[PDB]
């Protein structure tokens, strides 16, 4: 997948937890499903879908607290993903202790992030439910008084790598809620355009813009209006022809997610400057095709698709 623009400061997803909690396994699930979104050089840092991922272990019996690391690592955190092995009840108190330490550190250096707890290794159809619940409740007993004092509202997920949709849904749903989807898609488009030297990129659903990136902001209104008119003249389920908005040529791919009897029609559009046409247009088309396939897949996790409701004002307020 595409690199992030190194002159830019992406938002971070922190994937934290005790050693053995399952985080590398969770990461690899995402990477096997969405390699097209990942810049792949055990890795502790990688770029994914317009975000920077930080995957760090804590605790255990080795000489365990090596995070107390430069301050830059706790800056720009927007998503705090914390993995808790609920089979390992004896380590739950240790897990909660690091959780609280890391939340306090993150609050010191990052201003506005949200918390997602992955209650992990809840393997499908298998006994163990009493222990799983006891571990989850013990974790919450340890962490909620502090969370409540700090006025967080964490989200709880229930995951297992042996049921990979649970992991894919937990990891992707936070990025694609109505409050975060526009920024997520916009940052993903920025990375996509940077990686192959495109001028701008837009994503639409039902002809409404849900993500946008422009290397020149002066043209946003003009291109957005022209794209709206172009899309409103297109029929369902045909290739979208290229067109020119001088000096740009714009290429569009369409994709669809059905929810019951209803379709959500999406469009992915990117622009090149005709006065500097890339030497390898095939590379751009092949990249767009692969990206579109994976965008369709990850957007199955958006609140839009999960509820079957396009809430324009909520998406615009999320910005």
Ligand X SMILES: Nc1nc2c(ncn2[C@@H]2O[C@H](COP(=O)(O)OP(=O)(O)O)[C@@H](O)[C@H]2O)c(=O)[nH]1
Q: Give contact residues for ligand X (rule: CB under 6 A).
A: 17, 19-25, 57, 120-121, 123, 160-162
Q: Which stretch binds Mg ion (CB under 5 A): 18-26, 191-199, 237-245, 293-301?
A: 18-26
Residue with smaller CB distance to ligand X, 16 or 194: 16
The distance of closest approach from Cβ of residue 14 to Mg ion in the complex, given in angstroms and rounded to an integer, is: 14
The distance of closest approach from Cβ of residue 57 to ligand X in the complex, given in angstroms and rounded to an integer, is: 5
The distance of closest approach from Cβ of residue 22 to Mg ion in the complex, given in angstroms and rounded to an integer, is: 8
**Of the candidates 243, 193, 211, 257, which has an alpha carbon nearest to the alpha carbon of residue 8?**
193
| Residue 120 binding: pick among Mg ion, ligand X, none (C-beta 5-8 Å cut-off by kind) | ligand X
Which residues are CB-neighbours of 10 under 8 A, at least 6 positions away? 4, 47, 50, 51, 52, 76, 187, 191
**Token duo for residue 315:** 């998406």
Q: What are phi and psi of 9, to 5 degrees?
A: -115, 85
Separation of alpha carbons 160 and 122, rounded Å: 5
Q: Which stretch binds Mg ion (CB under 5 A): 20-28, 86-94, 157-165, 230-238?
A: 20-28
Residue with smaller CB distance to Mg ion, 22 or 201: 22
**By the rule CB under 5 A, 206 interacts with Mg ion:** no
H helix intervals, the chain: 23-33, 92-109, 129-149, 164-172, 181-195, 220-232, 281-299, 303-307, 312-318
The distance of closest approach from Cβ of residue 59 to Mg ion in the complex, given in angstroms and rounded to an integer, is: 13
Q: Please answer whether residues 37 and 294 qualify as being in contact, where contact means their C-beta atoms are separated by less than 8 angstroms.
A: yes
The distance of closest approach from Cβ of residue 162 to ligand X in the complex, given in angstroms and rounded to an integer, is: 6
Separation of alpha carbons 15 and 171, rounded Å: 10
Select the residue interacting with Mg ion from 5, 20, 24, 162 (CB under 5 A).
Answer: 24
| Residue 188 binding: pick among ligand X, Mg ion, none (C-beta 5-8 Å cut-off by kind) | none
Q: Which stretch binds Mg ion (CB under 5 A): 23-31, 203-211, 220-228, 302-310?
A: 23-31
Residue with smaller CB distance to Mg ion, 24 or 169: 24
**Of the candidates 173, 182, 231, which has an alpha carbon nearest to the alpha carbon of residue 211?**
182
Q: Please answer whether residues 112 and 149 qualify as being in contact, where contact means their C-beta atoms are separated by less than 8 angstroms.
A: no
Residue with smaller CB distance to Mg ion, 28 or 222: 28
| Residue 201 binding: pick among Mg ion, ligand X, none (C-beta 5-8 Å cut-off by kind) | none
The distance of closest approach from Cβ of residue 304 to Mg ion in the complex, given in angstroms and rounded to an integer, is: 33
Buried-state track 2-36, b at ≥16 Cβ within 10 A, e below 16: bebbeeeebbbbbbbbbbebbbbbbbebbbebbeb
The distance of closest approach from Cβ of residue 110 to ligand X in the complex, given in angstroms and rounded to an integer, is: 22
Residue carrying the six token digits 């430069």 = 70
**Of the candidates 219, 302, 187, which has an alpha carbon nearest to the alpha carbon of residue 255?**
302
Residue with smaller CB distance to Mg ion, 40 or 144: 40
| Residue 161 binding: pick among ligand X, Mg ion, none (C-beta 5-8 Å cut-off by kind) | ligand X
Residue with smaller CB distance to Mg ion, 23 or 213: 23
Applying CB under 5 A, the residues found at the interface with Mg ion are 24
């Amino acid at each position: 997948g595409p690199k992030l623009n190194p002159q830019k400061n992406p938002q971070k997803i922190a994937l934290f937890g005790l050693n053995y909690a399952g985080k590398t396994s969770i990461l690899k699930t995402i990477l096997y499903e969405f390699e097209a979104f990942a810049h792949i050089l055990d890795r502790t840092e990688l770029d994914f879908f317009g975000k920077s991922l930080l995957i760090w272990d804590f605790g255990g019996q080795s000489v365990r607290d090596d995070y107390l690391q430069p301050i830059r690592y706790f800056q720009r955190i927007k998503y705090f993903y914390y993995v808790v092995d609920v089979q390992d009840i004896d380590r739950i108190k240790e897990s909660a202790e690091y959780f609280l330490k890391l939340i306090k550190l993150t609050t010191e250096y990052s201003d506005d992030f949200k918390i997602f707890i992955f209650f992990h290794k809840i393997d499908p159809n298998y006994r163990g439910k009493t222990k799983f619940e006891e571990s989850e409740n013990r974790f919450l007993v340890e962490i909620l008084p502090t969370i409540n004092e700090l006025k967080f509202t964490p989200t709880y997920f229930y995951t297992s790598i042996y049921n990979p949709i649970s992991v894919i849904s937990a990891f992707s749903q936070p990025l694609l809620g109505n409050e975060t989807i526009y920024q997520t898609l916009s940052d993903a488009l920025d990375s996509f355009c940077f990686n192959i030297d495109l001028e701008f990129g837009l994503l639409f659903v039902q002809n409404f813009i849900i993500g946008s990136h422009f290397s020149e902001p002066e043209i946003i209104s003009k291109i957005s209006k022209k794209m709206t008119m172009y899309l409103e003249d297109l029929d369902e389920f045909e290739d979208c022809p290229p067109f020119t908005v001088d000096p740009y040529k714009i290429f569009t791919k369409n994709f669809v997610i059905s929810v019951g009897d209803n379709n959500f029609y999406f469009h992915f559009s990117v622009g090149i400057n005709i006065l500097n046409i890339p030497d390898d247009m095939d590379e751009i088309f092949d990249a767009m095709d692969e990206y579109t396939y994976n965008l369709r897949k990850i957007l199955e996790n958006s609140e839009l698709i999960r509820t079957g409701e396009l809430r324009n004002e909520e998406i615009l307020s999320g910005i």
